[PDB]
Design a protein around this ligand. Structure first.
Ligand SMILES: *P(=O)(O)OC[C@H]1O[C@@H](n2cnc3c(N)ncnc32)[C@H](O)[C@@H]1O
Length: 340
């Protein structure tokens, strides 16, 4: 899992490759991403500011004239959402602009996060109805949130983890949910807040339904069960479920401030099942021994979801020690689902 989303960072041009039939543009590789650029705007090795997909860029026709026709209103401001595109057949994701367009970054170094100085914020799809409830309090500071870094941003890490084994799970398109025990308190959280129980709150309903609160009372340990709530009325319901349900993907050990490993998590899920508490888990694929490029990893992401008749969002890879994870989102999914 991870820190702040570095939406805009100083990165380096990698290989530049022609786009057949399109002499005014070319393909720039930037880490594990491919970005269409104007012909000659970069050469291999040049630095630039790379803005990832899901960046929302406030309207400014001087700095960002290439975005001018894509301006929308979003959370009260005018600007452009960057999203996946496919131009002269070339997949294109993000925006890469030369350093000389940013005189205020004259003193910066390759790798720097420039999101805040450039005023970039994150676009997200709208939240689903009964997933915001009354707030009890902050997302607990003693539990990690569930964000995962992208494979495209991890090129040296993927190389450094050659030979290491990963649990591979299907990435479900829902909302992150955490149900935890800390001493005398059991709480249910969404992605960012701890929620109050009401008749209408979806997370609480899913936690009562699968007896996972009872399961935590049984284990008698300070643990956060983290998973995806999916189903009807949640993010278009890709799985075509009836009703909603929680699918575990991680367990956080609150007292040790660490995740359980995949084998430790499997064992505890088995113990819960063995004692009548059936908490469902995200689909687990074959463990992978890593010996792969980012491209090769991305090529794995499309495939069957929980519902084997639909094409999945992607995959999450969790190293067997529980200390290194990342996501590989299916670019076919991003192409199909323009609201993603
Ligand atoms: P996505 O781009 O929303 O990034 C991380 C979130 O994915 C959710 N999630 C769904 N399925 C999984 C699996 N299999 N492993 C871990 N995380 C999963 C979480 O809500 C993350 O916050």
């Amino acid at each position: 899992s991870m820190g702040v989303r570095k939406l805009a960072t100083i990165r380096t041009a990698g290989e530049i490759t022609p786009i057949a039939g399109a002499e005014a543009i070319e393909c720039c590789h930037v880490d594990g991403w491919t970005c269409v650029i104007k012909k000659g705007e970069f050469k291999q090795g040049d630095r630039g500011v790379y803005f990832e997909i899901d960046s929302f860029i406030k309207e400014d026709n001087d700095r960002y004239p290439m975005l001018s026709k894509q301006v929308i209103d979003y959370e009260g401001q005018r600007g452009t959402r960057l999203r996946t595109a496919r131009l002269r057949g070339q997949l294109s994701q993000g925006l890469f602009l030369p350093m000389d367009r940013f005189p205020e970054l004259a003193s910066n170094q390759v790798g720097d996060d420039v999101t805040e100085i450039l005023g970039i914020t994150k676009w997200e799809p709208p939240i689903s109805t009964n997933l915001s409830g009354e707030i009890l309090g902050e997302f607990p500071t003693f539990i990690s949130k569930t964000d995962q870094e992208r494979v495209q941003n991890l090129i040296p890490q993927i190389e450094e983890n050659k030979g290491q084994k990963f649990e591979v799970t299907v990435k479900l398109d829902g909302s992150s949910m955490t149900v935890y025990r800390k001493d005398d308190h059991i709480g249910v959280c969404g992605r960012n807040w701890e929620l109050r129980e009401t008749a209408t709150n979806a997370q609480w309903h899913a936690a009562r339904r699968n007896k996972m609160i009872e399961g935590l009372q049984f284990l008698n340990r300070n643990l956060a069960l983290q998973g995806e709530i999916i189903g009807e009325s949640i993010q278009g319901n890709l799985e075509k479920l009836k009703g909603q349900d929680f699918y575990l993907f991680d367990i956080y050990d609150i007292d040790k401030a660490q995740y359980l490993t995949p084998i430790e998590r499997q064992s505890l899920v088995k113990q819960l099942n063995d004692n009548g508490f059936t908490v469902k888990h995200v689909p687990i694929l074959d463990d992978l021994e890593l010996n792969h490029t980012a491209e090769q990893i991305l090529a794995m992401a499309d495939g069957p979801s929980l519902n084997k008749n639909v094409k999945r969002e992607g995959l999450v890879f969790k190293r067997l020690d529980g200390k290194f994870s990342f996501k590989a989102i299916s670019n076919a999914y991003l192409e199909k689902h323009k609201d993603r």
